[PDB]
Design an enzyme around this catalytic site. Structure first.
Site, PDB file in Angstrom:
ATOM      1  N   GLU A  17       9.805   2.618  10.931  1.00 36.04           N
ATOM      2  CA  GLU A  17      10.598   3.719  10.863  1.00 36.04           C
ATOM      3  C   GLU A  17       9.915   4.912  10.695  1.00 36.04           C
ATOM      4  O   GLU A  17       8.917   5.201   9.763  1.00 36.04           O
ATOM      5  CB  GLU A  17      11.491   3.493   9.694  1.00 36.04           C
TER       6      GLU A  17
ATOM      7  N   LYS B  43       0.908  -1.171  -0.056  1.00 35.77           N
ATOM      8  CA  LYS B  43       0.103  -0.151  -0.063  1.00 35.77           C
ATOM      9  C   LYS B  43       1.078   1.220   0.045  1.00 35.77           C
ATOM     10  O   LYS B  43       1.402   1.627   1.108  1.00 35.77           O
ATOM     11  CB  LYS B  43      -0.888   0.073   1.299  1.00 35.77           C
TER      12      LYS B  43
ATOM     13  N   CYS C 289      13.199  11.800   6.148  1.00 36.72           N
ATOM     14  CA  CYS C 289      12.964  11.229   7.081  1.00 36.72           C
ATOM     15  C   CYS C 289      13.902  11.188   8.138  1.00 36.72           C
ATOM     16  O   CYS C 289      13.689  11.578   9.377  1.00 36.72           O
ATOM     17  CB  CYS C 289      12.596   9.505   7.132  1.00 36.72           C
TER      18      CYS C 289
ATOM     19  N   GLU D   5       8.960  17.890  13.599  1.00 35.57           N
ATOM     20  CA  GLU D   5       9.327  17.444  12.113  1.00 35.57           C
ATOM     21  C   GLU D   5       8.639  18.108  10.906  1.00 35.57           C
ATOM     22  O   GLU D   5       7.285  18.242  11.180  1.00 35.57           O
ATOM     23  CB  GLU D   5       9.176  15.859  11.934  1.00 35.57           C
TER      24      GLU D   5
HETATM   25  C1  LIG Z   1      19.187   7.368   3.270  1.00 34.65           C
HETATM   26  O1  LIG Z   1      19.407   8.629   3.276  1.00 34.65           O
HETATM   27  C2  LIG Z   1      17.996   7.072   3.862  1.00 34.65           C
HETATM   28  N1  LIG Z   1      16.858   7.605   3.258  1.00 34.65           N
HETATM   29  C3  LIG Z   1      15.479   7.319   3.784  1.00 34.65           C
HETATM   30  C4  LIG Z   1      16.795   9.187   3.423  1.00 34.65           C
HETATM   31  C5  LIG Z   1      16.815   6.995   1.852  1.00 34.65           C
END
Ligand SMILES: *[C@H](O)C[N+](C)(C)C
Ligand SMILES: *[C@H](O)C[N+](C)(C)C
Lengths: 495, 494
Positions: free
Chosen positions: B254, B179, B288, B387
């Site tokens: 995550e 999804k 992220c 964030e």
């Molecule tokens: C590497 O930088 C990790 N991400 C999620 C940003 C791809």
């Protein structure tokens, strides 16, 4: 011999509960109050985790080496062994399990601390483990740091041993911990607090809070500074623990018992197998999270097998756990006694026949005593075929083909363990692979070595404890990636 | 010229049972450039039943890792062959500069190739003996696929984030329902045809686009889904875990963060400044693990931030397809607003927009925002804690090493962190003290499929990628056998 009166074990010293409550200790053999244990509340949880956090931050535990912490774990295994007779006596009167079972638990407690002293040591050579990268600009390695302050919640069926399964690896990883044992059996875990002092474990590295579930356990699970929870107990409670942890996206491990099948084919030594079927459902007074409590036996040898089953079963001496030759004690509590009886009761009300047992032993007027019980003429729609009974209660159905066996064995929401009996070892391998289970025993039932990983799948929970998997539950796996090039990234245009 | 696809279910293109669809928007022009199907609970139900049957057949889950690896490599080869196609669809759907997109698509090929390798390594670990201290018993470990898994991936690296979950799960022998986000679903749907082109058995991977509550939530709560892998916001993560808890099903999370970049005095300023730009503005700030909080030494502060804005200044903010584009629009106006709100709220709480804070001067439409640098920070400000998920950086000074450590760790998050210093001893000390899942040393943001990835604290738990990737999708099965054929000898023989 009498029983200890303890306070809570917090920050290396003995502390009265802040609200000062205590609850009783009952001997399951006699239904009598034989002492009492302190009953912690959220206020006590708060000071135990503050102490655990303080201890984690000190310079003497969490950043120390695995070899260093190993000296403490070996000291514990030694101490436990030195005070062997004391712990088995307490465990026997508290848990109600036969003396002989008890001695093997305390043996296994010391073996678990030894094994993980070793795992602590082996952890040192795993530090800064290199990760080869495609690009020579960058290099990488892995650090295995302790995660932090952890909450350990352990059941009463093997009180000290279930606590150690969580205490041992967490301390090996360098964590500090708060232990919440079950209110039904907290005596040896509390005594464990002395062992900690006597080996000079830094204060606050392990804190032991006894008490009721909602009072001592729930606040631990919901506490904002507890980094992780390791829980073993009922699937119903495990769901509540995880729901709570989810508020702070706090990781958990869960081992939630089950309804494990024991699958018996036509080609076996029926006397060796029937003893394993007995051990797999009636040992620990039937209070086994991995109980092989569904017997599936090929109708070819069914009648004979069931015959010799009852035969071996009748010969099980039911008695007070301290008397020589005891092979079955009382179940842990009156609540549990009632629950098992209601399971047996409901079984016949749905039209199943109680082939053997199903009631108190007439010769024992006091204590939560129950007969080893064999239920037959079973439908797969009955409550007793679906649900964990956690008493000495065995269900039985026959099967025609291997494929019917597998489907019957796997027809459950649970999936902790299973056992398969057949001299055809090719057949054993086929069944082993097909079982929707985290642990399979071949031609035995129930031996659990600290060397091998342990846990379930499906509604029996997730995560593996023990073996080379035990320590990892308590680690922050830290990636470290360094640019050794000393040259412009070259992605953005300079001004 | 965007594709029109149905749901990918059981190796077929199937229409949503309630046959609804939703817009697809180019973030650069704000124009509806197409539409994707929107699944509901009914669609989930048939997609899970489709994954489950596919898991029970004898051509995937019980086959070897090596067998499954042939499909992994075929996928990687097909993606490489269809590179141009995927790179353009991503660039228009997600909004990151074309240059960022080519790297993404390269990375998904490499990610499938890596996990083909790990699938083959997986065969070599089957029946790994465990030594027991009793001669009566022997033991080994089997590593079997868990079952049907629900994969939920976010929009900042649409296909790449999806790949990060598909690749290990398929490697493990699971079957899967994916999804993706409603905000960037086109390459993921397009991945469906790739699966048919390589002959992936029907039901092994299923791709339901749709709304969170209509499509995601029922997947998470489905009683026949064995596990959920989720990347997204901490808030949604709490919700998926809470839901999964109802049926005690495992979860990996995550959840982004508020990652610090710590810069000490002994650094080549221009190199470090460029990495800092990369850490917070790259992927249009939708990172992220964005190092969105600059902790820079006193003695080298104001210099650092001048050359910092002097780098931030000639970052070409163009449409993503235009030449030299080093920053594009953010994903949607929904996201555009709350990034704007985050910036005004910063001014109100008394922060100073040292640069940016507004719409790019020269680009009249599209969800564009200048790379923003914010100083005059107190740690109690909203913008310091939360964030933003946009091209907005916070700066603060420090002078003690112990002070930087405390400021860096002063967050409930704990995904990643970057530390800069010529002295590598000091790098080591800091990387150990950071309460975080990944530390970059003298760089920021490079993520190799070779290395374990994930956070601690509010940023979630679990490690993906590397030699950790596959084990999230495995049932570690203990098998311990009595080879004595002797009586156990516990009870008494009748
Ligand atoms: C590497 O930088 C990790 N991400 C999620 C940003 C791809
Ligand atoms: C191994 O037998 C594990 N238990 C918990 C049942 C003893």
């Amino acid at each position: 011999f009498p029983i200890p009166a303890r306070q809570l074990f917090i920050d290396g010293e003995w502390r009265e509960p802040i609200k000062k409550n205590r609850i009783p200790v009952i001997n399951p053999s006699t239904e009598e109050i034989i002492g009492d244990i302190p009953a912690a509340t959220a206020e006590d949880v708060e000071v135990a985790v503050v102490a655990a956090r303080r201890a984690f931050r000190r310079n003497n535990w969490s950043a120390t080496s695995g070899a260093h912490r190993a000296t403490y774990l070996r000291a514990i295994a030694a101490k436990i062994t030195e005070k062997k007779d004391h712990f088995v006596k307490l465990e026997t009167i508290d848990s109600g399990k036969p003396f002989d079972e008890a001695v093997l638990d305390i043996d296994d407690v010391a073996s678990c601390f030894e094994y993980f002293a070793g795992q602590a040591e082996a952890l040192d050579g795993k530090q800064k483990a290199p990760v080869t990268l495609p690009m020579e600009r960058f290099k990488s390695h892995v650090l295995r740091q302790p995660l932090g302050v952890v909450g350990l919640i352990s059941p009463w069926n093997y009180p000290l041993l279930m606590a150690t399964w969580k205490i041992a690896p967490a301390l090996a990883a360098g964590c500090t911990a708060v232990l919440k044992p079950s209110e039904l059996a907290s005596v040896t875990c509390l005594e464990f607090g002395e062992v900690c002092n006597e080996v000079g474990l830094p204060p606050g590295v392990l804190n032991i809070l006894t008490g009721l579930g909602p009072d001592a356990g729930a606040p631990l699970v919901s506490h904002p500074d507890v980094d992780k929870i390791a829980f073993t107990g009922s699937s119903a409670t495990g769901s509540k623990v995880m729901a709570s942890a989810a508020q702070l996206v706090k990781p958990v491990t869960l081992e939630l018992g089950g309804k494990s099948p024991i699958v018996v084919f036509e080609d076996v030594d029926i006397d060796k197998v029937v003893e394993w079927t007995i051990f797999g459902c009636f040992w620990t007074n039937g209070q086994i999270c991995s109980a092989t409590s569904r017997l599936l036996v090929h109708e070819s040898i069914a009648a004979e097998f069931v015959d010799k089953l009852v035969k071996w079963t009748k010969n099980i001496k039911i008695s007070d756990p301290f008397e020589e030759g005891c092979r079955l004690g009382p179940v842990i509590s009156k609540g549990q006694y009632d629950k098992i009886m209601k399971f047996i009761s409901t079984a016949k009300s749905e039209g199943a026949t109680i082939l053997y047992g199903g009631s108190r032993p007439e010769h024992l007027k006091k204590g939560y005593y129950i007969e080893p019980t064999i239920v037959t003429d079973i439908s797969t729609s009955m409550q007793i075929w679906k649900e964990e009974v956690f008493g000495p209660v065995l269900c039985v159905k026959t099967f025609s083909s291997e494929d019917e066996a597998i489907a019957l064995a796997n027809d459950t929401e649970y999936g902790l363990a299973a056992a398969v009996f057949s001299n055809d070892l090719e057949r054993c391998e086929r069944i082993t692979k097909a079982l929707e289970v985290g642990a399979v025993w071949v031609n035995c039932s129930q031996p659990c070595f600290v060397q091998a990983p342990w846990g379930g799948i499906k509604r029996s929970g997730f995560g593996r404890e023990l073996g080379e998997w035990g320590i990892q539950n308590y680690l922050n796996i830290k990636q470290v990636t360094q640019d050794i090039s000393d040259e412009p990234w070259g992605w953005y245009k300079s001004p």
